[PDB]
Design a protein around this ligand. Structure first.
Ligand SMILES: *[C@@H]1O[C@H](CO)[C@@H](O[C@@H]2O[C@H](CO)[C@@H](O[C@@H]3O[C@H](CO[C@H]4O[C@H](CO[C@H]5O[C@H](CO)[C@@H](O)[C@H](O)[C@@H]5O[C@H]5O[C@H](CO)[C@@H](O)[C@H](O)[C@@H]5O)[C@@H](O)[C@H](O[C@H]5O[C@H](CO)[C@@H](O)[C@H](O)[C@@H]5O)[C@@H]4O)[C@@H](O)[C@H](O[C@H]4O[C@H](CO)[C@@H](O)[C@H](O)[C@@H]4O[C@H]4O[C@H](CO)[C@@H](O)[C@H](O)[C@@H]4O)[C@@H]3O)[C@H](O)[C@H]2NC(C)=O)[C@H](O)[C@H]1NC(C)=O
Ligand SMILES: *[C@@H]1O[C@H](CO)[C@@H](O[C@@H]2O[C@H](CO)[C@@H](O[C@@H]3O[C@H](CO[C@H]4O[C@H](CO[C@H]5O[C@H](CO)[C@@H](O)[C@H](O)[C@@H]5O[C@H]5O[C@H](CO)[C@@H](O)[C@H](O)[C@@H]5O)[C@@H](O)[C@H](O[C@H]5O[C@H](CO)[C@@H](O)[C@H](O)[C@@H]5O)[C@@H]4O)[C@@H](O)[C@H](O[C@H]4O[C@H](CO)[C@@H](O)[C@H](O)[C@@H]4O[C@H]4O[C@H](CO)[C@@H](O)[C@H](O)[C@@H]4O)[C@@H]3O)[C@H](O)[C@H]2NC(C)=O)[C@H](O)[C@H]1NC(C)=O
Ligand SMILES: O=S(=O)(O)OC[C@H]1O[C@@](COS(=O)(=O)O)(O[C@H]2O[C@H](COS(=O)(=O)O)[C@@H](OS(=O)(=O)O)[C@H](OS(=O)(=O)O)[C@H]2OS(=O)(=O)O)[C@@H](OS(=O)(=O)O)[C@@H]1OS(=O)(=O)O
Ligand SMILES: O=S(=O)(O)OC[C@H]1O[C@@](COS(=O)(=O)O)(O[C@H]2O[C@H](COS(=O)(=O)O)[C@@H](OS(=O)(=O)O)[C@H](OS(=O)(=O)O)[C@H]2OS(=O)(=O)O)[C@@H](OS(=O)(=O)O)[C@@H]1OS(=O)(=O)O
Ligand SMILES: O=S(=O)(O)OC[C@H]1O[C@@](COS(=O)(=O)O)(O[C@H]2O[C@H](COS(=O)(=O)O)[C@@H](OS(=O)(=O)O)[C@H](OS(=O)(=O)O)[C@H]2OS(=O)(=O)O)[C@@H](OS(=O)(=O)O)[C@@H]1OS(=O)(=O)O
Ligand SMILES: O=S(=O)(O)OC[C@H]1O[C@@](COS(=O)(=O)O)(O[C@H]2O[C@H](COS(=O)(=O)O)[C@@H](OS(=O)(=O)O)[C@H](OS(=O)(=O)O)[C@H]2OS(=O)(=O)O)[C@@H](OS(=O)(=O)O)[C@@H]1OS(=O)(=O)O
Ligand SMILES: *[C@@H]1O[C@H](CO)[C@@H](O[C@@H]2O[C@H](CO)[C@@H](O[C@@H]3O[C@H](CO[C@H]4O[C@H](CO)[C@@H](O)[C@H](O)[C@@H]4O)[C@@H](O)[C@H](O)[C@@H]3O)[C@H](O)[C@H]2NC(C)=O)[C@H](O)[C@H]1NC(C)=O
Ligand SMILES: *[C@@H]1O[C@H](CO)[C@@H](O[C@@H]2O[C@H](CO)[C@@H](O[C@@H]3O[C@H](CO[C@H]4O[C@H](CO)[C@@H](O)[C@H](O)[C@@H]4O)[C@@H](O)[C@H](O)[C@@H]3O)[C@H](O)[C@H]2NC(C)=O)[C@H](O)[C@H]1NC(C)=O
Ligand SMILES: *[C@@H]1O[C@H](CO)[C@@H](O[C@@H]2O[C@H](CO)[C@@H](O)[C@H](O)[C@H]2NC(C)=O)[C@H](O)[C@H]1NC(C)=O
Ligand SMILES: *[C@@H]1O[C@H](CO)[C@@H](O[C@@H]2O[C@H](CO)[C@@H](O)[C@H](O)[C@H]2NC(C)=O)[C@H](O)[C@H]1NC(C)=O
Ligand SMILES: *[C@@H]1O[C@H](CO)[C@@H](O)[C@H](O)[C@H]1NC(C)=O
Ligand SMILES: *[C@@H]1O[C@H](CO)[C@@H](O)[C@H](O)[C@H]1NC(C)=O
Ligand SMILES: *[C@@H]1O[C@H](CO)[C@@H](O)[C@H](O)[C@H]1NC(C)=O
Lengths: 616, 616
């Protein structure tokens, strides 16, 4: 009996499951104050228990919202399969404050988007009660369930202080239309239409070119959108999908004359996630984006190269000041349909600067309006912090992600732990630290959060309960972000996790307290030299025995050299080289001793990349 | 004693060595009719024995050509280290027919290029004999030894039937100049200067932008150049190094008036080596190029992505008709310094078509001349055969290459074997075949041809002697292209090499004859099922024994699943799953049986990716 780490996480409890059948789950809303996680699904919305999702009943904690038969016949007549496509897949769940806190919901609805307003307890509003501007989600949530959309319900900052839903999706049956859209401005008390809707210019591929959204948030006086689209400026050289960030002013009221339903402050910028060199290596396609609830200045996202050819993913981090810096910089421009994309001199920019917020945007001169009409793309690409990714890996496709922040004050240490999903269903546990003034990282653990054939559709994080939440097509799993005792039974693996520390007095890994052993940055190698598992064993002559450290090698460690050393009194200190018979090497870093004898006995140390793992 | 393949190739003889010290060897010329391989080096040129390079003496088979002291003092005064930089490194060795067959030689010569004419027996010409147009290699071979240059001595097709040396290199001390150059045309009988020199327009980055040549040949009525340079058309999107092919007419006589020393038929085209998809994946940087001596219609080359970021190499094949098709297509154009690169309509092309050969090129109209002056780059990229590479591998940098052709007529099978060098000093043995109307490949073997820290500078192939020739900085090694008996002792490895066939009657691998076993395309799996090594062995109770197929797993096979099956009368047919004690898996695909007993005995088959390897 050697080192052994139990598998994770498919079958103290740290993994909780919930399932009412293959319901194509999607769309998260986490309310930490009420211990509820609202999860959308096909024709259903659930309200789960945040501390333990297994305590929710499929019948008591649900509110079915299946489409109407009139919309089903329309969808079948189009040519779409009625089994899943002509159903209602929820895509928007946002907090809404109308006569108290309620929920805003939106769904595909058999390729006919329709929104609702429901109470927190998953009960419809009184049928006699009317909802101003609700009933049709024409530009609020997509038609096709597979479409990547985004939205956020903003309360403050809009014109006249009214509420509205900023979103970005299709807004037509065919893929022709694609728009960043704001709903009609309604005063929900009196029900009067106080302002028309805002949307990107129709069929202007310079604004959006076959986009795929991954997230959207409200920060300061703006609303930001993260997505990937076809690179309009790369066309002269080839085909490429670039990642973009788009910014609009909350108080944007539109243009003049006939173009009042179009944005007066819409600007987008390419996002830079490359490796610093004379010839950078860009991860151009974004896959997801996460923001911490308490911090509105940092954004984390997953980027991938084109899924064809050689594949590589990467995680980049961006500051709000760097995003605003791109929107405050020069403007890209293509003079004619045959000109090259060149920057604009500051002398030609009209004032007020296009993109800057302004009460009543119709007051702006025709110069400013028509300038931003044909200059949506900023010349500068958004700079990623430190000029390099936080982590990257070859032949891996990374999707959703969630980031946590840890700080041990008495040692003055701050860590960032990234929980990145892979298309193979695994979650990468990646830590970030500062080693001698520079930023490095190290993949701590890899645990399976779903079978290979079941992708991860959505993922969120709860700092209060300290648990990770992953949604798939078949079920929803709750995973703790720290399983020190249940996972790490070795000092080697325990001291590398910032959540954990190795107690030498109880001989077990457990949550970190001051005084326990930990070295995440590997700045003090050999810390576990005294907590190493050493198992002296004398066996009979001739018979062959197996010396090993781990039962099965941990996933993140299998790609490290396992060098065995042997100190014998007659032979001395030397490194064991493998021979066809006596010295056999195992796939778990073990050492087999075929034909044991007198000269074999001695001190046996098993190093792993120059650091002791176990001894015999 | 199981399967065992001896290492290769660092220490019947198939590996022959030659070395007179670290002489920075480079530049090959293979004369199959005289059994001699002319190899350049630092201050020396050698004449080796083609059938056995070890039979050459460092003193009898050499002609030292070290620089003059006047040129050394110049080079030391520049600021270059006199140890290696201020020496003479040969870069051009070409056959020359003057009063019989002689050699043309060119060398760096302490950053002052100088050419010579020497006899085949490595003896200087009589000092009284003069050589027309020889003495200075200003545009004939580079200044810096590390510079990638190319050249070829063409005899027929030039104006007035005179000989000249087409080349491409620096032609200045600084990196400022870079030119495809033709020497002055001299009638070697009378010594009269019959025509001036030809060269690319100076400082025109549209023609060449920091190029790196990899080869050059004469085909038909043209002379082609293969190189990589900065992508002038990619500038509007970023930085990229593209691979180019350049074509000039042999009978090019220059322009009119003042621009007579410039080419009138110079055209270049980007080379396409990508993976076919909606979003192609380009291997943009070429590293070397090989042509078969008997075939002037096929070209093979190694391409790599940018060496920064994620790394990948690939091998592409091109037909002469596809190269000419690009030079016969539309023309790329950038109207202004701020325009985009667009094609030219055929209605605007002047006649005669620029680039087409014409006796006396000064006769062409000013339209044709000035057109090709500003239109050197063809719009079409040279298409690679079958639209995909022949082979590609991740995290490997491939350099020089040589290709052989095999044909077994009685079975109607034609193979192509690629011998591609890696920066780690290894040679990849890659075979190409047709499987159901389509082209596939499979890496047959990987053998070390040089230590890791010693790169491979040049490589050639001799069809007559059937041997491969690799040159490094320290030595020159001769390697046979087929070592069936000395390498393959297993039917599994023997039937995959097109050079080899497994004889079941002598139980050994050996050169292929009709009737022997072979399946390169894996179209008949299980062919070796009767030639499998089966070694029944009964051992004592309790003691642990090791079951294995290979002593050490062959390099090209280590990344394949090793599944052991066990048929016991009581248990039946099943796949052996590894347990922590009894069932141990070795890194060599073996199976260890800890604590042997009665239930363990039985038929033990060891499969490798669904094909039987060995049994017990
Ligand atoms: C190396 O070898 C490879 C293997 O053979 C080869 O692979 C092939 O790669 C392409 C991608 O490069 C694959 O995808 C195809 O792409 C085609 C090109 O589309 C894009 O480019 C269009 C043209 O843009 C150039 O030309 C303009 C006019 O001159 C310039 O203004 C541009 O600046 C640009 O110039 C550059 O390129 C020129 C051409 O080389 C060059 O002269 C110039 O100097 C400069 O370098 C764009 O119009 C187009 O944009 C449209 O579409 C996108 C979305 O796709 C929108 O965002 C835009 O708003 C705009 O609407 C692209 O950017 C496509 O034509 C082709 O599409 C057709 O086929 C697909 C098949 O699925 C259909 O889905 C599609 O509807 C098209 O069908 C239509 O046309 C066909 C043909 O007529 C017709 O049969 C059909 O009925 C229908 O009408 C496709 O997407 C291609 O698949 C790969 N092939 C293979 C076999 O794998 C690689 O290119 C080679 N590399 C080189 C360098 O040669
Ligand atoms: C994401 O983040 C990454 C990390 O921060 C970041 O990495 C950096 O990448 C660059 C490469 O992109 C690395 O290399 C540098 O490249 C610089 C650019 O050089 C090339 O581009 C020049 C300009 O071309 C653009 O602009 C023209 C004018 O507008 C247009 O006409 C062009 O079409 C093109 O436009 C495109 O780009 C615009 C800019 O973004 C954009 O507005 C526009 O819309 C369009 O998209 C070219 O002139 C230049 O070509 C010259 O040189 C090549 C050979 O290099 C020749 O073949 C040409 O004939 C021509 O002569 C390039 O194509 C370089 O300026 C920079 O060089 C300087 O520094 C190096 C350091 O080694 C020196 O060797 C060199 O001599 C230069 O020094 C000089 O300038 C500096 C600065 O003033 C000065 O201090 C010094 O004394 C000297 O005077 C360098 O090579 C760079 O290293 C990476 N940084 C890091 C930290 O790693 C990446 O770019 C980011 N991505 C994005 C999208 O932002
Ligand atoms: O010292 S501890 O904080 O770790 O707790 C003392 C012993 O509890 C165990 C299990 O015993 S039991 O829970 O009473 O059944 O560890 C377990 O408890 C800790 C913290 O206690 S708490 O009640 O759950 O709050 C858990 O950490 S935490 O997630 O709550 O922060 C352990 O989970 S984890 O892997 O650290 O994240 C949990 O371990 S387990 O998964 O149940 O096995 C003992 O652990 S054990 O004896 O090593 O098996 C603790 O004694 S210890 O040896 O010092 O670890
Ligand atoms: O393989 S070795 O030559 O390195 O010996 C290691 C094993 O022998 C023991 C037996 O200990 S005992 O039961 O108390 O007799 O230790 C003995 O050998 C070591 C040598 O290894 S070391 O790296 O030098 O320390 C001796 O060390 S030394 O005298 O050479 O300096 C041990 O003395 S010491 O306290 O380590 O300095 C010596 O034990 S003793 O003190 O003479 O009695 C085992 O070491 S143990 O775990 O401390 O008991 C070693 O394991 S084994 O299973 O017996 O192979
Ligand atoms: O049947 S064979 O053509 O292979 O030749 C008969 C036996 O010769 C050996 C070695 O015996 S020896 O050369 O007399 O010393 O194979 C060797 O000879 C063959 C061909 O004969 S030749 O004189 O060299 O032309 C070589 O093939 S070839 O390269 O010449 O085309 C063998 O080299 S290779 O690996 O096939 O390329 C060479 O094998 S070795 O490198 O010397 O070991 C016997 O091989 S052996 O007994 O298996 O060891 C041949 O008998 S065999 O069992 O049928 O192979
Ligand atoms: O592990 S198994 O149950 O599969 O048995 C395989 C080993 O037993 C032998 C002993 O042969 S003997 O010395 O001649 O006695 O073969 C015997 O077992 C096999 C079963 O394997 S198989 O895949 O079915 O063929 C018998 O086959 S069968 O009767 O089940 O159909 C052998 O008979 S047969 O000619 O293969 O059909 C049987 O041998 S015998 O004919 O009854 O005498 C060894 O096979 S051997 O190499 O042919 O001699 C097997 O190797 S072991 O080292 O003994 O483990
Ligand atoms: C904490 O930091 C320690 C100090 O840096 C780490 O120890 C180091 O571990 C590395 C990796 O094993 C050792 O690197 C050496 O690399 C050379 C070169 O070999 C290279 O090529 C081979 C063949 O392809 C390849 O297998 C190797 O991985 C290398 O890429 C080898 O000759 C050496 O044997 C060794 O591998 C350092 O030498 C080693 N330093 C010390 C002081 O031990 C330690 O692993 C870190 N621990 C953790 C948990 O992060
Ligand atoms: C000649 O052709 C035969 C027929 O094609 C080859 O046999 C085939 O070999 C492959 C590779 O072993 C087998 O592929 C299967 O793949 C599935 C899926 O597993 C995948 O994922 C795992 C985990 O990542 C990975 O390890 C695998 O490699 C796969 O990528 C597995 O479930 C199977 O066990 C097996 O691996 C074919 O099934 C197999 N076919 C047959 C009929 O045996 C043979 O290898 C070829 N021989 C030569 C010399 O080329
Ligand atoms: C989360 O809630 C579920 C119930 O929804 C709990 O599952 C049961 O827990 C008890 C105590 O371990 C067992 O006796 C039961 O057999 C469990 N399952 C069933 C089907 O009854 C679960 O223990 C809760 N976990 C936490 C951490 O609160
Ligand atoms: C190639 O030539 C070398 C000599 O230049 C040969 O090397 C010697 O060969 C004989 C026969 O095997 C040995 O007895 C010698 O000891 C070898 N070395 C020396 C230093 O004398 C080599 O055998 C030749 N190989 C072939 C295939 O012709
Ligand atoms: C909406 O209308 C009410 C009167 O019905 C008014 O008091 C209020 O200020 C208006 N605006 C908001 C945001 O409620
Ligand atoms: C400017 O915006 C403010 C926002 O509070 C608004 O009250 C005001 O009416 C707007 N116009 C002027 C002229 O201040
Ligand atoms: C054309 O080229 C040929 C090549 O043999 C040459 O003899 C002839 O003088 C050239 N000019 C004409 C008009 O034929």
């Amino acid at each position: 009996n050697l080192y052994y780490e139990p598998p994770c996480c498919t079958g103290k409890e740290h993994v909780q499951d919930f399932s009412c059948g293959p319901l194509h789950y999607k769309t998260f809303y986490m309310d930490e104050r009420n211990n509820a996680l609202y999860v959308g699904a096909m024709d259903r919305i659930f309200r789960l228990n945040l501390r333990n999702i297994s305590q929710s009943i499929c019948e008591r904690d649900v509110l079915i919202l299946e489409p109407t038969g009139s919309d089903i016949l329309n969808c079948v007549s189009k040519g779409k399969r009625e089994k899943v496509e002509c159903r209602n897949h929820i895509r928007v769940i946002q907090p809404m404050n109308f006569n108290g806190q309620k929920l805003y919901v939106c769904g595909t609805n058999a390729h006919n988007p329709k929104d609702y307003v429901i109470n927190a307890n998953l009960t419809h509003l009184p049928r006699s009660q009317y909802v101003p501007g609700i009933g049709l989600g024409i530009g609020k949530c997509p038609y096709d369930p597979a479409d990547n959309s985004t939205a956020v319900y903003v309360e403050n900052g809009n014109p006249f202080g009214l509420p509205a839903l900023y979103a970005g999706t299709n807004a037509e049956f065919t893929k022709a239309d694609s728009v960043i859209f704001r709903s009609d401005l309604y005063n929900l008390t009196n029900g009067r239409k106080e302002a028309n809707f805002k949307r990107t210019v129709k069929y202007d591929s310079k604004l959006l070119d076959k986009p795929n959204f991954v997230g959207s948030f409200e920060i300061g006086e703006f609303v930001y959108f993260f997505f990937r689209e076809h690179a309009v400026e790369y066309i002269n050289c080839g085909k490429a999908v670039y990642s973009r960030v788009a910014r609009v002013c909350k108080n944007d009221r539109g243009g003049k004359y006939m173009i009042s339903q179009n944005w007066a402050t819409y600007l987008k910028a390419r996002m830079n996630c490359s490796i610093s060199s004379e010839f950078p290596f860009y991860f151009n396609e974004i896959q997801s984006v996460y923001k911490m609830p308490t911090d509105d200045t940092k954004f984390y996202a997953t980027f991938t190269t084109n899924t064809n050819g050689l594949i590589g993913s990467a995680v980049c981090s961006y500051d709000i000041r760097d995003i605003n810096a791109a929107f405050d910089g020069k403007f890209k421009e293509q003079a004619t349909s045959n000109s090259a994309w060149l920057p604009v001199l500051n002398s030609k920019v009209p004032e007020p600067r296009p993109g800057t917020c302004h009460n009543d945007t119709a007051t702006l001169p025709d110069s400013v309006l028509n300038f931003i009409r044909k200059h949506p793309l900023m010349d500068k690409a958004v700079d990623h912090e430190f000029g390099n990714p936080v982590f990257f890996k070859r032949d891996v496709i990374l999707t959703k992600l969630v980031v946590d922040k840890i700080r041990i004050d008495k040692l003055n240490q701050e860590f960032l732990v990234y929980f990145v999903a892979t298309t193979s269903g695994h979650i990468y546990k990646i830590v970030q630290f500062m080693h001698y003034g520079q930023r490095h990282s190290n993949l701590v653990d890899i645990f399976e959060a779903s079978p290979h054939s079941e992708p991860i559709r959505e993922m969120t994080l709860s700092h209060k309960t300290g648990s990770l939440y992953v949604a798939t097509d078949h079920q929803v799993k709750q995973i703790d972000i720290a399983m020190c005792a249940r996972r790490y039974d070795s000092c080697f693996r325990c001291v590398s996790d910032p959540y954990c520390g190795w107690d030498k007095d109880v001989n077990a890994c457990r949550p970190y307290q001051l005084g326990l052993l930990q070295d995440v940055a590997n700045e003090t190698s050999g810390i576990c030299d005294t907590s190493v598992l050493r198992k002296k064993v004398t066996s009979s002559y001739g018979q062959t025995l197996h010396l090993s450290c781990f039962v099965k090698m941990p996933e993140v460690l299998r790609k490290k050299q396992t060098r065995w050393y042997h100190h014998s009194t007659e032979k001395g200190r030397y490194e064991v080289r493998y021979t066809p018979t006596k010295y056999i090497d195992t796939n778990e870093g073990g050492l087999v001793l075929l034909a044991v004898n007198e000269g074999d006995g001695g001190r046996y140390d098993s190093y792993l990349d120059g650091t002791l793992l176990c001894s015999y």
